Structures are given as C-alpha cells and as structure tokens.
Amino acid sequence: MKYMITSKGDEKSDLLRLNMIAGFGEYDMEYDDVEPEIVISIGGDGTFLSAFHQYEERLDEIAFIGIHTGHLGFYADWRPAEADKLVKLLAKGEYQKVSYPLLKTTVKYGKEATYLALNESTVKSSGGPFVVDVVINDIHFERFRGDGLCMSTPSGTTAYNKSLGGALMHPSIEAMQLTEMASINNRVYRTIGSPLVFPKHHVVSLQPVNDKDFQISVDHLSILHRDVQEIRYEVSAKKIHFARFRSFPFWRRVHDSFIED
Amino acid sequence: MKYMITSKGDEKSDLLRLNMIAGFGEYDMEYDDVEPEIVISIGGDGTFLSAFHQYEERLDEIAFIGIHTGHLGFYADWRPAEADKLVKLLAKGEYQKVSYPLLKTTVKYGKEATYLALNESTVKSSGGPFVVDVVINDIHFERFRGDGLCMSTPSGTTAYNKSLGGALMHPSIEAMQLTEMASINNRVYRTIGSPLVFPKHHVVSLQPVNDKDFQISVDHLSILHRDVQEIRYEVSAKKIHFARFRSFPFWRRVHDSFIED
Amino acid sequence: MKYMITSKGDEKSDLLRLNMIAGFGEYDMEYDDVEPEIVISIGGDGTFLSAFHQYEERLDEIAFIGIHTGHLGFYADWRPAEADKLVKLLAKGEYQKVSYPLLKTTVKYGKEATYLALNESTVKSSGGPFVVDVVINDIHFERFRGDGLCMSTPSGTTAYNKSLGGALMHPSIEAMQLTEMASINNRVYRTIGSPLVFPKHHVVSLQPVNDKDFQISVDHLSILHRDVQEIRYEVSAKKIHFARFRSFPFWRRVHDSFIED
Amino acid sequence: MKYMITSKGDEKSDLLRLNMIAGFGEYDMEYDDVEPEIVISIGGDGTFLSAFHQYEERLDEIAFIGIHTGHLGFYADWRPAEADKLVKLLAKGEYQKVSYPLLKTTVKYGKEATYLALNESTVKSSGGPFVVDVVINDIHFERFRGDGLCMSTPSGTTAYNKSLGGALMHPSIEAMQLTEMASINNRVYRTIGSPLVFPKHHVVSLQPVNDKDFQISVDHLSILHRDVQEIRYEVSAKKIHFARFRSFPFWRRVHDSFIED
Numbered sequence A, B, C, D: 001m002k003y004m005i006t007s008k009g010d011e012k013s014d015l016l017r018l019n020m021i022a023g024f025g026e027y028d029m030e031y032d033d034v035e036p037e038i039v040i041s042i043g044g045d046g047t048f049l050s051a052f053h054q055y056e057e058r059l060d061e062i063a064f065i066g067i068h069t070g071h072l073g074f075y076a077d078w079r080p081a082e083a084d085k086l087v088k089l090l091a092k093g094e095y096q097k098v099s100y101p102l103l104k105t106t107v108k109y110g111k112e113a114t115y116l117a118l119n120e121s122t123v124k125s126s127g128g129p130f131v132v133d134v135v136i137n138d139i140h141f142e143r144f145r146g147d148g149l150c151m152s153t154p155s156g157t158t159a160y161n162k163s164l165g166g167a168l169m170h171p172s173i174e175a176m177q178l179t180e181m182a183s184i185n186n187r188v189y190r191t192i193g194s195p196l197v198f199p200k201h202h203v204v205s206l207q208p209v210n211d212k213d214f215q216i217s218v219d220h221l222s223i224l225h226r227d228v229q230e231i232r233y234e235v236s237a238k239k240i241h242f243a244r245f246r247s248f249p250f251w252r253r254v255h256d257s258f259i260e261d
C-alpha cells in the first residue's frame, strides 16, 4: 500500500530509510507522503511524536510503526536489525492494528484552538506565578498554585507523567491523568496532591485567576497563549493506530525500559 | 422491600437505627437480615465495609446505603439529619443504582482461598523480610523487596492507596491499582516505584522467593497465610451496587473530604 | 538606634508603617535607610525577602524584624496588632539576635557573579532541555536531566524545597539542601532522586553538558545567564540576623503554618 | 593492638577471617574479643550492624572496619581482595579515625530502656492502628495516624530513610531525621508529610493516644514494648569511630551504591 518513512536525520537513520525504500521497491508499495496508509518513523520517540503530528488529520487512515536507532523508545517496536523482516511483513500485510487513546486540549480566548496529544499537554505560566482554578465537569475542585499541571494519555504515563509521580496506566484504559508540578500547600493554599485519573467524557477545565497568559505544551511543542479564558482537557474520540507484527506487551515494554534489558 | 440496618454501636447510631426502623414500619417494608434487598449502614466507612462483607455472597441482590454519624465517610451519602428523608425515598423506591468495581484476591497453597475487596488487599511478610516476584499476565516484571504491596479498587484509591502515593481514579473505570510500600532501590535491587494501573482481565501474581508466610489484609481484615505459593489479583466480575437518591459526584466527594467542606 | 521600615505598599501596610514611625519619634531613634541597624519589613515573606536583598551588603550590621499584615509569613514574628508593643521593645533594645544560615551561588562565564539567597537558588534551562553534570567536591556525582534543580537554605526548606519533597531542617543546622524538579529516570538516565543535604564547606557545582544558557533564580529574582561554564553552591560565611523579643520556636512556626493555627 | 573479626558465616567470610587472623599473627597483634581496639566485620551491612551492637558499650575504645564479601555495603571500605593490604596497614597503625553520629532512643513505661542506633529506630503498632502525638521540645507538633515513623541517623539516611523519601545527609552533620510511613491525610487528619531534620539537643517524644503497645526496631532488631508512656529520640552524645586508610568520600560511596559502579 501507500507508505512513507520519516527519519531523525542522522546518518544511521537516513541510510536505514534509504534501504527500506529500496526493499519496498521490490513489492506493490508506493512511496506517498501525502496520503500514506503506513507511516514508519526511524529514530527515537521524539521522531515518532513528530510523525504523529505530521499526520494528525488522517489518523483513522494510517497505521504507525516505530524503529529505534538509539536505545529502546517506547513507541518503537523494532530494532534497526529487523528492518528487512519488517519490510517483508508489511509487504504481505494482514497484520493487526492496536489503538491507543489520545488527549484533546481546547484553548479558549477573547477564539478557540484545539490540539491532540499522544504523550501529554502541560500548562505553566508565561512567567510570573501560575494560579488556576481546576473545574471538573463544572464542579470547582481546587485552586492550584505552583509550577504547572500535566495531563497525560495512557501511553504518556511512562513519560513526563512518571517523573511527576503519576501512575503508569495500561493503554487499553480510555482515560487521562492529571499530575501536579510543585504545588504550594500550607494552611492557606491546598491542592489534592495526588494524581487524578479521569474517564472518557469527563472534562477538566483550567480557569485563570489573575494572569491570563500561559505556556501550553503538547508533546514536544510549546506555545505561548495570551488572553486565555479556559483550557479544557478531555479524552479524544480519535485514536492512534499501530501496525503490530508480534506480541510486545505494554508491561513487558515497561519492564524493558525501566527495570532491565 | 426487604431491608436491614447495621450500626456502629454507639448510642447515636443505635438510636438512629431504631428510629429508621420505626419509620420503615409505616411502609410496605419488612426487616430481614437474611435476604435484604437494601442494606443501610449507620456509622463510618469501617461500618460500611463490615456491611459489605456481611453480604458479600448476595451482592447482586442488594443495594447499599451509608449514613455517616461522624465526619463524612466516603461510602456515606447521607448525614443523620436526612434519615427521615431517606426512609421516605427508599419507601417509594424507583431510585437508580450505581455500581463500583471490586478486587478479587486468590491465595494458593500446598488449597485455594478467594477474597473480595471494596477498598484494597495488601500483603506484607509475617515478620522477616518481604520479597516477592511480581508477575503480570505471566511476564516476570520485577522482584519487589520492601515493606509490602497494596492493590486498590477505584473507590479504594482515596484510602490506603492515596497514602502510598497512588492516583485517585474515578470508579467508573474498571481497574485495580498496585502501589509499593517502602521498596529498596540501589544498584542491586530495582522496582518500578510508580503506581501501576491494570485493566479488567489482567492478572497480577505475587510469587514467594524465600519465605512463604504472609500477612494478607482485605479491607479491615488481616489474616496470616502459611505456605503460600501464589497470590493472584484481578478485577472481579462482581460489583457493589449503591442506591442513589441525588447527585453526589465522586469528584465532589473527593473535594469535600480532602480539600474543604 | 538607626532603623528603617519597608512596606508591601497596600494601605494597611503603609498606614502601619506611618504609625510605627510616629511611635519611634517618641524615642532616641533616627529613621535612616542608608545605614540602619534595624530593618522592619511590613508585609509578607516576599516583602521580607526584598528587605533582605536591599541590605545584603550590611547584613552584619543589621537586625531584621518581619510584621505580617496578611496571613502568617514565615519570616514574620509579629502581627500588626503588636506593632506598638514592638516599638517599645525595640526602643529599649537589649533584645537578643538569632542568626540563620545563607546560600552563596557563584555563576562563572567566558566573568563571575555571586548571589546570596535567604530561601533558595534554582536553575532551569533557558528553554530547551535542562541537562547538567552535578559535581560534589570535584567528584562527578550524576548527570541530571529534567526540569531543574533547587538549592535551599535551612529557613528556605519550608518554601519551594518543601513542594519538591525536601526535608524541613532546623535553621541552627549550617547546611544547604538540593532537590530535583521532575528528573527523567529510565534504564539510560539515572539520578539519585532523594534530596541531598550538604554541610558547610562542601561545594556543589553544576556543569553544562550541551546548552550553556540557564535561568537562575535567587529568592524572588530570576535572571537569564548566557554562556555559563559553572554554577557553584556553598553555604555562605554570611548570616542573617533577626531581632528576637520572645520565644517563637521554629518547630512551632512550622506547626502554625502547616498543621493548624 | 587488640583486635577481633566477626564473620557473616558463609564459607567465603569464614575463610577470609581465618586468613586475616593468620596474617595478623605475623605482627604485634593479639586476638581479643573481650576488649578489642579494632573490630573488623566481614560480610555485609547487617554483619556490620551486628558488630556495632556487640560492642556498643565500648564505642569510645574501638575503631570499626567493614569488608564486604557481597556487593558494596555502605559501612564497607574494603573488598575481600584488599584484606592483605588491610592487615599490613592496620598492623603499622597511624591511621586516622572518622566519627559518625548515633541515635539514642529512650522507652518509658509504667521503667526505662535505652537503645543506640547506627541506622535508625522505627516504631509501629503492635497490631491495630498506630496513633501517636509527636512532641518536639515539649511543643505538641502533630497527631500522627498511619503505618509508623522512622528516625534515622545521618549514615542511616541511605537506608530505610531513603525508601521513605527522606533526604540523604552527610554524616558530619550532627542530626537525626524523622520520616513518615503512610500517614492518613484528609480534612480531619493532618501531618506535616515532609521529613523533618533535627539538630543535637532537640528531643522528639512520641506519646500514645489510645493503644500503648508498640513494636520498636533499632537497626535489625525489633522488640514488642508494652504499656508505653513515651518514646524519646535525641542525637546521642556517643559516636561510632571508623579506621580510615584512604579517601572514600561519603558522596562517592552514595554515587557508587545508587548511581553506578
């Protein structure tokens, strides 16, 4: 089918990409980076995230595959040494697809931008103190004062979320997870402290208290937003699809990345 | 319908229970503590947990209601002052039921006991060091050395789980959450550290390494188990059902218990 | 003696300052904001920190007093209602001084700036990833990747340090404490995770790995430093002195601010 | 001088001990386990702790040395391969001694026992809930409800203290550190959460609230104490002395044990 290949751009990755293209040339496969059905990322997780965002408008038409040319990336299923095996297996096709959930961020102003995240969306102040009211399904839950907030997808729970003390969640769970960055807690200021895990259809809204300017990151990408009225988080209706050619269970991937390999 | 009422046993609770019985006597309601369809707990969360375990074999036939006579309990929907309003509403019926997930613990020996938990099941050594291999869906994940392990249901995430740094999870999510108690981590001993959240159908098995004796708690109840071969955790097929008479959202209950009220 | 009074600048603080000046006019006391021997701060802890920095070159000649006109500040010993009592007690003098330790930060370039902190000094990247080698007494200790690092004095341990999970340390201990902000830890990246507490004369040096630009905060004040070669932390030889008129033990101040009051 | 050697008791350790004895026989050295001036521990940190307690009444007369026959122990300075070098260096003598601080625990009843700790002293309930009032220098600081409390020496901060989230403290600092084990915190129950670091001469007293029976551990050794009125913690006047033959800085020892080696 139609496929394309992105590369991190070092020599190792570019060469691997050129060799996979040459091998695909031996099959009924057309290189097309406008309407691919398969997107192969050669690099690291950053490369994979960039491929995801390059095709975020055709996620229902695409299956993604990641090859890690450095150490094991979490969105990587293959080592460079398995590239030829991969070419052959994709060629035939008949592979199964697995889907992971995504995070929708909506930023309203004074006038609305939406963003999709594979790992997480975070919010910090644009300089100066960060203070927001946290509203869950229209219920005022807490006033947060501190460094920032991180909202993670399931597959992002092993990324920034983990470093903030979040739980690691199996990606079959349709949820998002909110973690705190250095909140202040004394007899006058109080937050929940604990990570919070939200199901589909729950909406978490951050509402400014004084300053209305925020730095909002989605995956690698950080944008200054001015005059913000609301930042809304919910699990997206959209999912990312992976081509799978063999079992590599999530919990084994976690073991291999954090325990030993 | 058939109902019964348990009491924590102080004067406040016993009297409230006697007055509710008198008020139910004015309706088509039969006091029956063998086959109730409604179980009212008057007390605290400990009282509620005891009521749950008293009827754990008829959970599909029962709706539970908790009245808190001390400060707000998490399984409590009513204050003592609303008891008469409760009697009247239960009387008519037509209320809706909400279900929360439960945790199944299986203990194998050398020969199998099962337990159901509403809050959590924990495991510690029977004295002497605690060392277990943690196996997830038959995949060896880590060797845990430390004080113990806690596996929580969603509604138990605001209990012991919270104190161990676990995420708080909305109870519509069918999951269980594993938290560590003081693990050792150095260049020779390594655990994941992070809480782990498991979906339905995943099985987490603890396998002894040296000592085979363990203290296993389920909710308030701690038992010494000897000659253990395996402790298996999975989300139960069984659910607890609550009678609901008005909206009291989980996240509001969390706010009221931990933020302010 | 010579004294001056700083105000947060709201009406409450300005008026209290004018009234204390009027009361000092009834004693052998000269208002002098060039060479004060007593510096009174009326406001909050931010006001107090600004007073400290306004006189950081004469700390051996000055005793500081803080009045909190909002909720209890940690550098505050007096409520506004005790101002007249304060005027009278300072007037006579004969009070005792208590000293707390301070933190010296040295920033080297390519060419050296020093800074004194009462609460802490933090370092983050100027945008882009933060990576530094952490060198303790010339011994390479770890390579830190994450959001940043915080080095606290003893009296700053109840401030940002606390929110980062640091220990609270009695201020008679001559030490500084280093806490992590969201470090990455996987099989390739490793930090100690735990706060570290250093005695006098130990030197902690941060050395860039790739990017040499950093945002360095000292107390409220954040500066972009370019082309950095080293950031050096050590307990200062200099101390801040407080006028004390009654016992208000540190641990009671901690109880009153975080437990209940 | 007079020396003795303890062994963990496996074949490796016993043989190393027999060979060191044979090598000491070539010098003016008398094996004496009643009044040693040098105590060599061959084993792990548990072996070292047992040697410390075997001679806790003559700590001012003794210098300790640890040889680790497994992986690096924290009280170990030597690998088995350096034993002959050690024999020769001890033989001559002229080595320098370094001192680390210790923890004094006093248990009062209804009638007083004291204990010295090298790593820590912990307290838990004897079964049933653990509730104590925490009193610092006679000031009621908090009521603690949870699993237990850990009070660490500086050199014990890399042991249980670390697993409980405590700071690691250089052992030249004369202090003790109190960490929480799973405290409950909601709108009715509140603790400080943060580790607390106390200087010499501060006294931390735990006072029962209901149950008066506690399990108190000192280093490896756990005792049931009944009818307790008070448990008092303070930094001891007594110190442990090590023979040092070369530089092995604490922070390097920390790096080697937790970062990489």
Ligand SMILES: CCNC(=O)NC[C@H]1O[C@@H](n2c(C#CCN(CCCN)C[C@H]3O[C@@H](n4cnc5c(N)ncnc54)[C@H](O)[C@@H]3O)nc3c(N)ncnc32)[C@H](O)[C@@H]1O
Pocket (backbone or CB within 6 Å): A044, A045, A046, A049, A072, A073, A074, A075, A119, A120, A155, A156, A157, A158, A159, A160, A161, A163, A219, A220, C129, C145, C146, C147, C181, C182, C183, C184, C186
């Ligand atoms: C500390 C600065 N950030 C990094 O060094 N990030 C790269 C590392 O993270 C790994 N990674 C990624 C990734 C990625 C690419 N990143 C850009 C790096 C450019 N070279 C962006 C991601 O950074 C994460 N990030 C940001 N700040 C962080 C922090 N303080 N601590 C931990 N992670 C942090 C955040 O989530 C973001 O999306 N997704 C996952 C995942 N799903 N599971 C497990 N691991 C994962 C990746 O293999 C590598 O090991």
Ligand SMILES: CCNC(=O)NC[C@H]1O[C@@H](n2c(C#CCN(CCCN)C[C@H]3O[C@@H](n4cnc5c(N)ncnc54)[C@H](O)[C@@H]3O)nc3c(N)ncnc32)[C@H](O)[C@@H]1O
Pocket (backbone or CB within 6 Å): B044, B045, B046, B049, B072, B073, B074, B075, B119, B120, B155, B156, B157, B158, B159, B160, B161, B163, B219, B220, D129, D145, D146, D147, D181, D182, D183, D184, D186
């Ligand atoms: C520290 C010792 N334990 C207690 O003091 N427990 C009672 C307190 O916990 C509240 N609670 C309960 C409950 C309960 C009844 N308990 C028996 C008490 C007898 N009087 C048993 C439960 O104890 C929990 N527990 C045990 N050890 C703990 C610890 N170290 N830290 C925190 N919780 C701990 C554990 O999960 C167990 O099941 N379920 C929930 C829930 N779902 N959500 C939110 N809060 C909840 C209850 O309102 C009260 O405030």
Ligand SMILES: CCNC(=O)NC[C@H]1O[C@@H](n2c(C#CCN(CCCN)C[C@H]3O[C@@H](n4cnc5c(N)ncnc54)[C@H](O)[C@@H]3O)nc3c(N)ncnc32)[C@H](O)[C@@H]1O
Pocket (backbone or CB within 6 Å): A129, A145, A146, A147, A181, A182, A183, A184, A186, C044, C045, C046, C049, C072, C073, C074, C075, C119, C120, C155, C156, C157, C158, C159, C160, C161, C163, C219, C220
């Ligand atoms: C979250 C953004 N910062 C604040 O809201 N800070 C003010 C609050 O902190 C209290 N405070 C201060 C102070 C102060 C003044 N601050 C400027 C505020 C301007 N209005 C600067 C200080 O901010 C600290 N800070 C920064 N980021 C933080 C974070 N994420 N979490 C916690 N603290 C944080 C940091 O250490 C800095 O120096 N010194 C101490 C102390 N010694 N003991 C105990 N409490 C203390 C003060 O009473 C008030 O309650």
Ligand SMILES: CCNC(=O)NC[C@H]1O[C@@H](n2c(C#CCN(CCCN)C[C@H]3O[C@@H](n4cnc5c(N)ncnc54)[C@H](O)[C@@H]3O)nc3c(N)ncnc32)[C@H](O)[C@@H]1O
Pocket (backbone or CB within 6 Å): B129, B145, B146, B147, B181, B182, B183, B184, B186, D044, D045, D046, D049, D072, D073, D074, D075, D119, D120, D155, D156, D157, D158, D159, D160, D161, D163, D219, D220
């Ligand atoms: C988890 C059960 N305990 C152990 O496995 N302990 C042995 C391990 O700890 C190391 N260790 C020791 C030691 C020791 C000997 N121990 C008996 C073991 C018998 N085989 C007793 C000590 O256990 C500590 N301990 C207890 N419970 C713990 C827990 N949950 N987490 C972490 N440590 C825990 C506690 O402090 C006690 O004194 N002193 C230090 C130190 N100073 N610095 C750094 N490391 C140190 C030792 O090298 C080994 O790696």
